[PDB]
Each structure stands twice: as C-alpha cells, then as structure tokens.
Amino acid sequence: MNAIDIAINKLGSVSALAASLGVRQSAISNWRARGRVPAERCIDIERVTNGAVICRELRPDVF
Amino acid sequence: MNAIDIAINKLGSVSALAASLGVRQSAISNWRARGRVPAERCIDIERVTNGAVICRELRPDVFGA
Amino acid sequence: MNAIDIAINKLGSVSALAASLGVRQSAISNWRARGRVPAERCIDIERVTNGAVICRELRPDVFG
Amino acid sequence: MNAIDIAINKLGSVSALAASLGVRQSAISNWRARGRVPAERCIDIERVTNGAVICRELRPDVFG
Amino acid sequence: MNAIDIAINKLGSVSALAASLGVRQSAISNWRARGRVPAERCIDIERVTNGAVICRELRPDVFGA
Amino acid sequence: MNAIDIAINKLGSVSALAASLGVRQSAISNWRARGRVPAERCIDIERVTNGAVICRELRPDVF
Ligand SMILES: [Cl-]
Ligand SMILES: [Cl-]
Numbered sequence: 001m002n003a004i005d006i007a008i009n010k011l012g013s014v015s016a017l018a019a020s021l022g023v024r025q026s027a028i029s030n031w032r033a034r035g036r037v038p039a040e041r042c043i044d045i046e047r048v049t050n051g052a053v054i055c056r057e058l059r060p061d062v063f
Numbered sequence: 064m065n066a067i068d069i070a071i072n073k074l075g076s077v078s079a080l081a082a083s084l085g086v087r088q089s090a091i092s093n094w095r096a097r098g099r100v101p102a103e104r105c106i107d108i109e110r111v112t113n114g115a116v117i118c119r120e121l122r123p124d125v126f127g128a
Numbered sequence: 129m130n131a132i133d134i135a136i137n138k139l140g141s142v143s144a145l146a147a148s149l150g151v152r153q154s155a156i157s158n159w160r161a162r163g164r165v166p167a168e169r170c171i172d173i174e175r176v177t178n179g180a181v182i183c184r185e186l187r188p189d190v191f192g
Numbered sequence: 193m194n195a196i197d198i199a200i201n202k203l204g205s206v207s208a209l210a211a212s213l214g215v216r217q218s219a220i221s222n223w224r225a226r227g228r229v230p231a232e233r234c235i236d237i238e239r240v241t242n243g244a245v246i247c248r249e250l251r252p253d254v255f256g
Numbered sequence: 257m258n259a260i261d262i263a264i265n266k267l268g269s270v271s272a273l274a275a276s277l278g279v280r281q282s283a284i285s286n287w288r289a290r291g292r293v294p295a296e297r298c299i300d301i302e303r304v305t306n307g308a309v310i311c312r313e314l315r316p317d318v319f320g321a
Numbered sequence: 322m323n324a325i326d327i328a329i330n331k332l333g334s335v336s337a338l339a340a341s342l343g344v345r346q347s348a349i350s351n352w353r354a355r356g357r358v359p360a361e362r363c364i365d366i367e368r369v370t371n372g373a374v375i376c377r378e379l380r381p382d383v384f
Contacts, residue, residue, distance in 0.1 A: 039102030039125045061103045062125065073140075075178035082175035083148035110147035111176075113140030129266070129308050136265050142242075154243060157268055161198040161244035204266075204306030211303035212276035239275035240304075242268035295360030296382045318360045318383065 003057045004032050007045050010052040020048040066120040067095045070108050073115040083111040132160050135173055135181040148176040196224050199237055199245040212240040259313040260288045263301050266308040276304040324378045325353050328366050331373040341369040 008028075011017040018025045021044055031037045037045060039062045042055040055063040071091070074080040081088045084107055094100045100108060102125045105118040118126040129137070136156070139145040146153045149172050159165045165173065167190045170183040184191040193201070200220070203209040210217045213236050223229045229237065231254045234247040248255040264284070267273040274281045277300055287293045293301060295318045298311040311319040329349075332338040339346045342365055352358045358366060360383045363376040376384040 039122070042125070043127055059102070062105070074176070075180075079176055079178035082172065085150065107147065111139070111144055113144035115140075133266065133308065136268075137262065140261075141265060142268050157202075157242050157244040160268070161202040161241065162193075163198075163201045203304070204308075208304055208306035211300065214278065236275065240267070240272055242272035244268075295380070298383070315360070318363070320364055 002032070003053045004028070004037060006053045006057075007049050010049040017048070021045065064120070065095075066116045067091075067098075067100060069120075070112050070116050071095075073112040080108075080111070084108065130163075131173075131181050131185045132156070132165060135177050135186075138177045138180050145176070149173065194227075195237075195245050195249045196220070196229060199241050199250075202241045202244050209240070213237065257313070258288075259309045260284075260291075260293060262313075263305050263309050264288075266305040273301075273304070277301065323353070324374045325349070325358060327374045327378075328370050331370040338369070342366065 008014060008017055011020055014025050014028055018028050021027075021041065023041070037058045039059055042058045042063065045058060046054050071077055071080050074083055077088050077091050081091050084091075084104060086104075100121050102122055105121045105126065108121060109117050119128060136142055136145050139148055142153050142156050146156050149156075149169060151169075159169075165186050167187055170186045170191065173186055174182050182191075200206055200209050203212055206217050206220050210220050213220075213233060215233075223233075229250050231251055234250045234255065237250055238246050246255075264270055264273050267276055270281050270284050274284050277284075277297060279297075293314050295315055298314045298319065301314060302310050312321060329335060329338055332341055335346050335349055339349050342348075342362065344362070358379045360380055363379045363384065366379060367375050
C-alpha cells in the first residue's frame with residue numbers, strides 16, 4: 001500500500017491531513033501524483049499519524 | 064559549522080568525496096554553494112565519512128534529533 | 129599492513145570503504161582473505177582514498 | 193588456496209590466526225597437513241575472520 | 257592516532273576483534289570509550305592484529321620504547 | 322620468591338623502595354597484599370632495582 005494512503009487512512013480525510021501538516025490539499029495531491037512526499041515532511045507525517053507510517057516507508061531513498 | 068566542509072575534509076578533497084558518492088565534483092560544489100546536500104544523499108555521506116558527519120548535521124530539516 | 133588495510137584506515141572502517149566503493153562489506157572482507165582486490169576496483173580505491181592507496185600498490189601484477 | 197590458507201591470509205599470519213583461536217601455531221600447521229580443520233573450530237574461524245571464511249567452506253561435510 | 261581503532265580495522269569489526277580476544281563486544285566498546293585497553297590484553301591484541309598495533313602503542317604508560 | 326620481595330631486597334627497605342618510586346609505603350603494602358604490582362609501575366621497578374627483577378617477573382600476565 002502507498003504510504004500517503006496509509007496516512008490518509010489514519011487522519012480520515014485529505015483536508016484533515018493537510019490541516020494537520022499545515023499544507024495545501026493540492027500539496028497532498030501533488031505528493032501522491034509525483035510518488036514523492038517531501039523529505040522535510042516525513043517526520044511531520046510520522047508524527048501526525050502517530051507512527052501508522054514511518055519515515056523509511058515514506059522515503060526509503062532518504063531514511 | 065559547515066557539515067559539507069567537514070565531509071570534504073574527512074575524505075580529503077572534493078574529488079575524493081565526489082568519487083565516494085558516485086557524483087561529479089560540480090555536484091559537491093553546488094551543494095556547498097547552496098548550503099544543502101540532497102536528502103537522498105545524506106546517509107551515503109554519513110557512511111563514506113565514517114560518521115564524521117551525520118544525517119542530522121547535513122539536513123536538520125529532514126532528520127530527527 | 130597491506131594496501132587493503134591502509135585503504136580501510138584511510139576511510140576509517142570497512143563500512144566506510146565499502147560504501148565509498150559501492151560494494152558490500154563482505155566483498156572487502158573477501159578481498160582481504162584472498163590477499164588482493166579485484167583489478168577492476170583499483171581505480172576507484174585510488175580515487176576514494178584521495179590518492180593515498182594507488183593502483184600499483186594494490187595490484188603490482190596489473191599496474192606494475 | 194583452501195579455506196585454511198585464506199583464514200591465515202585474513203589474519204595475516206599463522207601466529208595471528210593461532211592467537212585469535214586460542215590454539216598453538218603447531219595446531220594450525222597440523223590442520224593444514226590433514227587438509228581440514230576440526231569441526232569444533234569452524235564457528236570461531238568464521239567469527240575471527242569477520243565472516244570471510246565460513247563454516248561451510250571449512251567443512252562442507254559438516255556444514256553442507 | 258587511535259590504536260584501538262587500528263586494531264578494530266585490522267580485524268575488520270568490533271565483533272571480529274572481540275572474538276579474537278575472547279571478550280564481549282561491550283568490553284571493546286568500553287576500552288575505546290575510556291581510551292585504554294587493559295594492560296593484560298595488550299600482547300593479545302598485538303598478536304591477533306599481526307603486529308598492526310604493538311603494546312607500546314596501546315599502553316605507552318606500561319610498555320617501553 | 323615474590324617479585325616485590327626481590328625489589329625490597331635490592332632497595333634495602335620499604336621506605337627506600339617507596340621513595341625510589343615516588344609512591345606511598347601503603348602502596349607497596351597494597352601491592353604485596355593484592356599480589357599485583359601496577360602494570361604502569363613495572364618498568365620503574367625494573368629500573369630502580371637495576372634489573373634485579375624484570376617486568377615479566379612482576380607481571381607475567383602483561384609482559
Ligand atoms: Cl603452517
Ligand atoms: Cl574485514
């Protein structure tokens with residue numbers, strides 16, 4: 001499963017995830033479309049999802 | 064503190080660091096100019112420098128404390 | 129200490145040298161057990177060691 | 193070169209390998225003359241060689 | 257110069273050095289942390305490293321020049 | 322014979338040995354009681370005794 005989708009699963013919605021991270025919903029869409037969450041947002045997603053997804057899942061090329 | 068410079072000095076030269084990472088010297092020079100190594104190269108740098116620099120020193124905006 | 133040994137000291141560890149060459153640590157260990165590095169790795173060793181360990185020291189039979 | 197020979201190269205000498213295994217140098221020499229190491233020494237050889245010389249290479253009849 | 261690190265690198269890893277001396281890895285890590293191998297292990301280290309380090313390098317306060 | 326006792330034989334007294342080494346008489350007693358001269362004092366004892374006892378006699382586990 002895609003790591004972003006896991007994060008959406010945990011937050012319950014695109015708007016809730018976006019608000020949780022302080023980013024635009026368009027950002028989350030762009031991340032899903034490009035197949036890349038920004039490296040600098042990985043810890044924040046690991047945090048807001050309470051560990052449902054971790055950094056190495058989001059960006060194995062970085063972590 | 065300039066983590067990129069510590070890394071260059073650990074290997075001994077920009078050439079040696081570039082070689083150790085499989086990149087062009089110009090890439091290292093660019094990272095240094097902009098003060099930012101690519102996130103996906105931080106572990107590699109930590110490894111080739113034998114831990115003389117660590118990921119959090121290279122990209123504190125990416126790695127945890 | 130032989131050429132491999134000093135290449136390792138230069139990089140600081142087997143881990144660091146393996147990473148610098150794009151090989152597994154186990155490959156370095158195998159080279160040490162054989163007593164020599166593959167010819168095809170010598171150029172890269174010379175580069176990543178900042179010239180401290182040169183091709184002709186690694187493989188005199190190849191590089192003279 | 194066989195497994196014993198490369199274990200010796202890895203450690204650097206018969207002295208160094210004997211010391212690393214807690215055996216007399218004469219024991220190493222005896223193993224070489226027999227053509228194989230005792231099964232009970234294979235785990236330690238694998239360890240002290242940093243994995244370069246593994247049990248199954250030393251004693252295929254035991255370790256496969 | 258760090259004689260303990262030269263010894264670790266000669267064997268290839270802390271595990272291999274520990275094995276060669278019949279000690280726990282934690283012992284090697286402790287020696288390194290405190291910058292001092294036990295006097296009674298110096299000859300053993302000199303032997304297992306095939307002389308890549310010698311007793312006087314390990315414990316200059318114990319061995320002669 | 323005990324190596325420390327040989328050293329005392331050579332220096333002539335506990336105080337002379339202690340002074341020769343720059344240590345407390347209590348140190349020499351402790352060394353005798355514990356059955357261990359400090360490794361870092363072996364060369365000094367070999368020196369002050371002019372070779373009457375040598376390092377390998379004092380600490381065969383070290384030398
Ligand atoms: Cl032999
Ligand atoms: Cl190794």
